[PDB]
């Protein structure tokens, strides 16, 4: 996560997309329905 090739696939249209971006869900806290989450920055962006 946060490094190059954090998301990979054999083609742009391939459905067999494999990734490990270290995404974790958090318990919602405010009564309005919404799903919060946090995630490492795009390692592709870091390499760029």
């Amino acid at each position: 996560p946060g490094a190059f090739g954090d998301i990979q696939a054999s083609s742009l249209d391939a459905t067999d997309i494999v990734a490990r971006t270290d995404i974790r869900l958090l318990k919602p806290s405010v009564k309005n329905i919404h799903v919060p989450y946090t995630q490492a920055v795009s390692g592709y962006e870091m390499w760029k």
Binding site: V30, N32, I33, H34, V35
Partner: protein
């Protein structure tokens, strides 16, 4: 058209404006930003072809769909922007560098507007920064967002609308809950006060065996309309792909003019050269040896130096 949870609004508080902002892509060399929104822009109330108006989910208890003139939309970031195109849930516009994208459907009083934090900074293409596309200079290849509404960048999978409960439908009197469906609007009054009690009524019906409104929910069935897979709606029983809408403003290659620098004055000396280069804006200079030892030198230069 669905209302959705908006991070910040003109009262600086959680809002459910049907103009909630989604993903804000900005990979366009020209600096145009593709914005997905939660209100359909580019259709009439029926959802047929049109360009002067837009349709957004209503706030009224009926929570139907209303269509208003698109002239009210004024995308703005650090400053006023300029709309480049409109197509359903997507808007294309060019904006000055800013920290946040703000959509303002507001008109006169109607101060509806949402804001999402998106870093936007002026970008340049080529090895020299330019504040404006320059008149003279070599032309290089680039890619910008297309203004043709037809050209498709992808699709988003929309699904059937999940049950939206509205409090007004339920009404508790003297500890007796009466579902009050809108006229001509059969409401599914599914409730459970110690025992499951579903059913559908269209008249003020006291839910028997039920005394706490906390145990009853009343909602109608408008499943004919389709909604985007937006994480602000509770998914319905089935969440499989109902349809696909093309993503407009597809990115396409094109040519871009870039500036040319001032030719460097060359001073020749023994086994060495001095470059008296000169450039007002940041200009990149790269020198590599033509031998096995590359020894490439890279440095952005500003002003004049040797």
């Amino acid at each position: 058209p669905y209302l959705g949870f908006c991070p910040y609004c003109r009262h600086s508080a959680p809002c459910f404006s049907p103009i909630k902002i989604e993903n804000v892509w900005d990979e366009s060399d020209d600096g145009s930003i593709r914005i997905q929104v939660s209100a359909q822009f580019g259709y009439n109330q029926a959802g047929t072809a049109d360009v002067t108006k837009f349709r957004y989910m209503s706030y009224d208890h009926d929570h139907d769909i209303k269509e208003d003139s698109m002239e009210k939309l004024a995308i703005s970031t650090s400053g006023p922007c300029r709309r480049l195109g409109h197509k359903g849930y997507f808007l294309l516009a060019q904006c000055p560098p800013g920290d946040s994208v703000t959509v303002s459907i507001t008109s006169g009083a109607s101060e509806n507007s949402c804001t999402v934090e998106k870093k936007i900074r002026r970008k340049f293409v080529g090895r020299e920064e330019y504040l404006f596309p320059p008149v003279h200079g070599k032309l290089v290849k680039c890619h910008v967002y297309d203004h043709l509404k037809e050209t498709s960048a992808g699709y988003i999978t929309m699904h059937r609308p999940g049950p939206h409960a509205y409090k007004s439908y339920l009404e508790e009197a003297s500890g007796e809950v009466y579902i009050k469906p809108p006229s001509g609007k059969n409401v599914t009054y599914e409730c459970k006060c110690g025992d499951y009690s579903t059913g559908i009524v269209s008249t003020r019906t006291k839910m028997n065996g039920c005394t706490k409104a906390k145990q009853c929910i009343a909602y109608k069935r408008d499943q004919t309309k389709w909604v985007f897979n937006s994480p602000d709606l509770i998914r319905h029983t089935d969440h499989s792909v109902q349809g696909k809408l093309h993503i407009p403003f597809r990115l396409t290659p094109t040519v871009c003019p870039v500036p040319l620098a001032h030719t460097p004055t060359v001073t020749k000396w023994f086994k060495g050269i001095t470059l008296h280069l000169t450039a007002t804006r940041p200009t990149l200079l790269t020198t590599r040896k033509l031998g096995l030892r590359a020894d490439a030198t890279a440095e952005w230069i500003t002003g004049t130096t040797s």
